[PDB]
Amino acid sequence: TIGKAIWLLWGLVFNNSLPVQNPKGTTSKIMVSVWAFFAVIFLASYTA
Amino acid sequence: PFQSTLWLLVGLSVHVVAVMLYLLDRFSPFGRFEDALTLSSAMWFSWRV
User: Fold this and answer.
1) Residue A27 and residue A42: Cα distance in Å, rounded?
2) Which residues of chain A are at the B interface, by a Cβ-Cβ cutoff of 8 Å?
3) DSSP string of B16-43?
């Protein structure tokens, strides 16, 4: 779960890129959503 | 604002990563048919990312 987790987070930081997959727990989906929000915020602050 | 050699270097990096994905794993020498498998898949991964 670490090897796929770091690649999933790396996929979320660089704008989707690869969807890979997604687990079943809702807490992981919420944390993935927050990480995607902070990812697009970091991308907006990076481009700006 | 930038010359075509910059985009030519961008594509050159696509070739370097494309052949690198084929070098990082063992497969077989293939200049026999027209369409390959790991080469087309690696190119779809390069154009995918």
Assistant:
1) 22
2) 17-18
3) HHHHHHHHSS-----TTSS--SHHHHHH
- If you search the block for the tokens 């989906």, which residue do you land on? A29
* Cα pseudo-dihedral A3, A9, A10, A14, rounded to 10: 160
Give chain A's largest Cα–Cα span.
35
Torsion angles phi and psi, residue A32, rounded to 5: -65, -35
Rg of the Cα trace of chain B?
13
Chain A residues within 8 A of B42 when measuring between CB atoms: none
The approach used to solve this structure was: cryo-EM
For B45, nearest residue in chain A (alpha carbons): A18
Alpha carbon of A14: minimum distance to chain B alpha carbons (Å): 9
Chain A residues with CB-CB distance to B49 below 8 A = 17-18
DSSP character at residue A4 = H
Task: Report the alpha-carbon distance of residue A28 to residue A1 in Å, rounded.
Answer: 12
* Structure tokens belonging to residue A35: 């990480």
